[PDB]
Amino acid sequence: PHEVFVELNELLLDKNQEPQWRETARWIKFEEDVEEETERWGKPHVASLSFRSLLELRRTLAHGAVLLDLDQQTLPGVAHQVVEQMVISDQIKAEDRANVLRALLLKHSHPSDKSKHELKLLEKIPENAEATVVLVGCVEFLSRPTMAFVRLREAVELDAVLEVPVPVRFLFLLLGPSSANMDYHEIGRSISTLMSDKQFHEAAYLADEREDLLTAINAFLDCSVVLPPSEVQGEELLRSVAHFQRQMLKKREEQGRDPLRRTGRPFGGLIRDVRRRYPHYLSDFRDALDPQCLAAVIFIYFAALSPAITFGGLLGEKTQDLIGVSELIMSTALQGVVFCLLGAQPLLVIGFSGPLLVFEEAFFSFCSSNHLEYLVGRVWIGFWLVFLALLMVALEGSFLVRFVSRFTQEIFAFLISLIFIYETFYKLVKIFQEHPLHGCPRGQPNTALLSLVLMAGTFFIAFFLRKFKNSRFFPGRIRRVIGDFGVPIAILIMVLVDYSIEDTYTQKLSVPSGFSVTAPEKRGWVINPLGEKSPFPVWMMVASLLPAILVFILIFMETQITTLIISKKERMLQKGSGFHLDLLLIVAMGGICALFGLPWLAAATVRSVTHANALTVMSKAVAPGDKPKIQEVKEQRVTGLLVALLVGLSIVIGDLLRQIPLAVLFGIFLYMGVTSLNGIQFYERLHLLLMPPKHHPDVTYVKKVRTLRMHLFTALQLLCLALLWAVMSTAASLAFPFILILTVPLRMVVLTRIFTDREMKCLDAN
């Protein structure tokens, strides 16, 4: 039981007709060949071998010389024993001993003739592996081909046969005349592909006699596929060539023979989470002393600051400056420090979200249309939120996230993107009416077109940098670093361009100077739950439960979905999960912060995923040609605390934030809206509605389902989304969380009634 590294050496004249042994190929997991006219290693590929070479090898292996459990530790002795066994096996006469022995002892040469190559290659080779050398060559002083196979008792590192220091266990000799129409390079390639797979080398390990090696090659042959002699193009191999192998292998092997659970005790989930996460406390403050940790704070800081200022600008221009940039910054800083010191999943980034923005819009519209204070109703909403969070934590109910499937999540994401796009286009439509494009802040000449130019420029700069991040240019290290700084670069470039122009007027941000409210003449710092100016009605202190339930539904959905996605198993997350503590902390802080007139926050799934990806380390000991794998994720609660502190210390520099026009922020808004459409399995199904059935891909939800049924599924999803969008534009746009809550069981019951069970496993895969 070991791992094998195989290398093929051939007898080829180097420069001055000296014989020389030259390396030609190398097998770790996949074959790599050396180009003859360039002398450099090619790309890895599947070792495809002919069938005549296999028969020639099988024919010649029967008459070969076999030596088992040899006791030599140097090439002299091994070669002498091999020659003696050859001459006593009636393969060569007693006159060719000297010439064959001379041919055996020569100088091996390699293309990369411990330097950098050995250090780099020893990483990709497994930790403790044993090596094989295949020596094949054409000899003009022989009559018939001769073969020898040896297995050493103890692994021995030979002097220079191999390019790297790996102990050698197996040797293969094949010398013969150029006649008999035999291709020795192909036979060597066949032997090296034989010795580089698990079954054959395991069978060769406990091999006692000659014919035990013929059974192994017979078993190798009845496990492979055969391709007929005809092909034209390259998309014909993307088909079953990879599916046929898996199906046949599964047939061979088949014929060859939690943090989400109701306990029953009150607050059981809290106790389990606290006793699972908190013991490993001092570790989270120690694994932060790494270069990667301090290189992730900057990008996370920018990615958390840009949406904060954008959403603050939109809220300030919409909420009559009751809540603006300063208040969002204070809420993000205050609630990002407490969570990262007490929460059980410090990889979540707490911030504002689109659904919360549209709910605030709807509640403001409700309050204005009925002449009620907007900041004293939020206090009672927060109180009821605190009560609701306590009650569901008390009776474990976080298992309800298991009932939310892809069907609802994709509708949610699509609606969020649509409202972002609508907001951006509404803003520019409104710009062109304040400043009409007539002849020679109500009549400025060059404002509307310059706003359009800024918005388009900041979009098109971030688009072609997200594109560049995914490309193949530059070193991979630097490409990843530069491609990680797209939005700040676009914002800085557009701000500099706008600052160069010193004649035209454009709207700017409204951040104030020092620790102050955005509207000091309107509100103070604490909102008394009895009425700022007029007394609050006594019938709304009780009837504020419904908006509390709706906002709780929104917060629960986003936070629990984020915690589900982050805690997947493919990501090596080992410390634990916070399904019950995170929700309690988030909702309690959201309820308390409403007393001071600050907004509610959520989990911010995309930012959390970005933060999780910037702390992963990829294993470098991966053989060429296989995909990279996650080594581990560095979990700690220092980077989140630092980001929360840094976001808070952005009011003291509010002088540099007043030079930023609103058009740049709305361009970044639209860029975030369009880019989020990727990754949801509803956008491509909607793309499939316009292509002919010949061009549909080979994804799992296409091969198993007829076209019309898939189109029916997509039509039902579109109908649900359109019904959700109709309610939002009316004067009763305080029920869309209820509409999603309705589309959950509607989905279950009705779509179970219509579609079969087999179809709802590919169209609605978990």
Instruction: Please report, as residue ranges, which positions from 487 to 506 form the binding site for its own copies (by CB under 8 A).
Output: 501, 503-504
Q: Which residue has the tokens 């006649």?
A: 179
CB 576 within 8 A of CB 565: no
Rule CB under 8 A: is residue 62 a binding residue for its own copies?
no
Q: Gap positions in the chain, given as the residue before each gap (C–N > 2.5 A)?
A: 113, 257, 440
Rule CB under 8 A: is residue 219 a binding residue for its own copies?
no
Taking the complex as a whole, the smallest distance from the CB of residue 579 to its own copies amounts, in Å, to: 35
Rule CB under 5 A: is residue 603 a binding residue for Cl ion?
no
Environment class of 385 (CB within 10 Å of its CB; exposed 0-12, middle 13-18, buried 19+): buried
Residue 504 CB neighbour total at 10 angstroms:
13
Taking the complex as a whole, the smallest distance from the CB of residue 352 to Cl ion amounts, in Å, to: 9
Per DSSP (E only), the strands in 65-217 are 65-70, 108-109, 130-138, 146-156, 168-176
Stretch that binds Cl ion, among 318-326, 570-578, 604-612, 738-746 (CB under 5 A): 604-612
Rule CB under 8 A: is residue 214 a binding residue for its own copies?
no
Q: What contacts 24+ positions apart, CB below 8 Å, involve 539-544?
A: 540/372, 540/377, 540/380, 541/380, 544/377, 544/380, 544/381, 544/384
CB 587 within 8 A of CB 555: yes
CB 488 within 8 A of CB 302: yes
Rule CB under 5 A: is residue 356 a binding residue for Cl ion?
no
* Residue 606 contact partner, candidates its own copies, Cl ion, none, CB within 5 to 8 A by sort of partner: Cl ion
- Which residue from 12, 19, 20, 29 is in contact with its own copies, where contact means CB under 8 A? 29
Stretch that binds its own copies, among 64-72, 311-319, 405-413, 625-633 (CB under 8 A): 625-633
Stretch that binds its own copies, among 166-174, 259-267, 329-337, 699-707 (CB under 8 A): 699-707
Taking the complex as a whole, the smallest distance from the CB of residue 249 to its own copies amounts, in Å, to: 6
Nearer to Cl ion, 24 or 608 (CB): 608
Handedness of CA 280, 286, 288, 292 (dihedral sign): negative
H helices of 162-211, in order, are 184-194, 198-205
Per DSSP, the residues of 597-623 read T----B--HHHHHHHHHTTEEE-S---
* Residue 442 contact partner, candidates its own copies, Cl ion, none, CB within 5 to 8 A by sort of partner: none
Site for its own copies in 388-447 (CB under 8 A): 436-440, 445-446
Taking the complex as a whole, the smallest distance from the CB of residue 38 to its own copies amounts, in Å, to: 6
* Residue 263 contact partner, candidates Cl ion, its own copies, none, CB within 5 to 8 A by sort of partner: none
- Which residue from 155, 372, 453, 497 is in contact with its own copies, where contact means CB under 8 A? 453
Nearer to Cl ion, 311 or 536 (CB): 311
Taking the complex as a whole, the smallest distance from the CB of residue 412 to Cl ion amounts, in Å, to: 13
* Residue 430 contact partner, candidates its own copies, Cl ion, none, CB within 5 to 8 A by sort of partner: none
What CA dihedral angle connects 643, 649, 651 and 654, to 10 degrees?
-90
Taking the complex as a whole, the smallest distance from the CB of residue 472 to its own copies amounts, in Å, to: 4
Nearer to Cl ion, 12 or 606 (CB): 606
Taking the complex as a whole, the smallest distance from the CB of residue 98 to its own copies amounts, in Å, to: 34
Q: Which two tokens stand for residue 87?
A: 């001459």
* Residue 244 contact partner, candidates Cl ion, its own copies, none, CB within 5 to 8 A by sort of partner: its own copies
Stretch that binds Cl ion, among 335-343, 598-606, 698-706, 714-722 (CB under 5 A): 598-606
Rule CB under 5 A: is residue 606 a binding residue for Cl ion?
yes
d(CA 405, CA 403): 6
CB 497 within 8 A of CB 525: no
Rule CB under 8 A: is residue 469 a binding residue for its own copies?
no
Residues making contact with Cl ion (CB under 5 A): 604, 606-607
